[PDB]
Ligand SMILES: Oc1ccc(O)c2c1[C@@H]1CC[C@H]2C1
Ligand SMILES: [Cl-]
């Protein structure tokens with residue numbers, strides 16, 4: 001009746017021993033947590049990073065949000081942290097005519113789903129979302145200011161979210177392409193009912209979220225295996241979200257009742273994340289939620305060796321949908337192979353397996369365009385080109401291994417799947433532009449094999 005809360009997602013309480021290495025722990029819980037999409041992690045009781053900030057000197061620009069189910073919103077005036085906190089507390093307090101910490105969490109959840117479904121409520125809220133900067137920085141300790149002995153303790157923690165991208169069990173790391181939205185932590189200031197719509201991470205990566213302080217955050221999550229099942233339910237009830245988006249900054253997303261999904265046999269899980277807890281989302285796991293009140297959270301994307309195959313399948317899927325990429329997956333693979341001597345040995349072994357698939361697909365593709373009559377060729381350093389200067393005119397994929405050009409249409413490229421879409425000239429006028437010959441590639445893969453012994 002009205003709202004039936006989904007079943008709870010798994011909650012983990014690792015010992016200090018298990019907690020020490022984040023990457024080993026995530027790998028251990030993976031068979032459980034990948035069945036539910038999200039999961040929650042309670043750190044050992046004495047792991048408590050200091051949070052310190054001046055509420056008057058931190059300022060940020062707020063986003064405004066309307067709260068209607070199935071209405072399109074796009075992914076990605078001034079407040080100090082204090083003035084925002086005052087606005088947010090007054091708002092919740094007046095909405096319920098109660099002291100903000102006496103409003104039960106079950107009630108806010110029930111009320112959230114009522115107000116987004118009711119056509120005649122026009123409730124709007126405000127929130128903060130931004131990567132770290134000079135005006136507003138990480139809530140975790142970072143180097144700069146003289147630090148206290150306890151701040152120093154957490155500087156090199158694996159669960160300090162600043163460190164997590166640049167550790168060596170992670171495969172974004174040795175990458176230099178500066179895909180900034182994905183190596184840097186985002187900061188989120190919440191108030192009651194402020195919401196994050198249904199979505200998955202760029203390139204189907206993991207994410208990890210830490211709530212520093214304040215009232216809880218409520219999550220809904222769907223396992224990766226049910227991603228297409230959820231998208232079919234979404235297309236049927238709100239097709240406007242699926243019209244082709246011009247850019248990467250034009251992704252359309254929405255609020256949708258998890259009960260609607262469960263009615264159509266999509267598995268949904270929930271949790272309340274409290275201050276000092278982590279939530280982790282797994283590859284291709286849809287998630288959404290809202291805040292119970294005034295709070296402060298920090299989040300980061302990351303990629304493990306487990307993810308490498310999915311990362312390839314994802315870029316393939318982007319091509320079918322003509323979606324833009326954040327980075328080139330093959331460029332990342334080749335960059336790791338060129339640094340094979342300093343890679344973790346398990347990393348090296350997993351990269352090698354992906355590289356073997358890459359090379360075999362590339363061989364087949366070059367044979368196919370040769371038989372279409374493209375004969376001329378020249379080496380080309382794709383990584384020097386700005387990304388928007390090396391997308392396939394048809395499918396918008398970011399080229400790195402190879403592309404086709406023509407003197408007729410200067411500066412345009414197509415990937416090798418779309419040779420017929422460049423122009424109307426005969427194929428002998430075309431040129432195959434390539435980063436590596438097959439003979440360059442096999443020694444790069446052999447270096448990985450040696451490093452992996
Ligand atoms: O196996 C699960 C797991 C979670 C969940 O919320 C649901 C199911 C069935 C499918 C939707 C409802 C019933
Ligand atoms: Cl509404």
Ligand SMILES: [Mn+2]
Nearest residue numbers: 200201207287
């Ligand atoms: Mn997310």
Ligand SMILES: [Zn+2]
Nearest residue numbers: 392395415418
């Ligand atoms: Zn293409």
Ligand SMILES: [Zn+2]
Nearest residue numbers: 406408423425
């Ligand atoms: Zn031409």
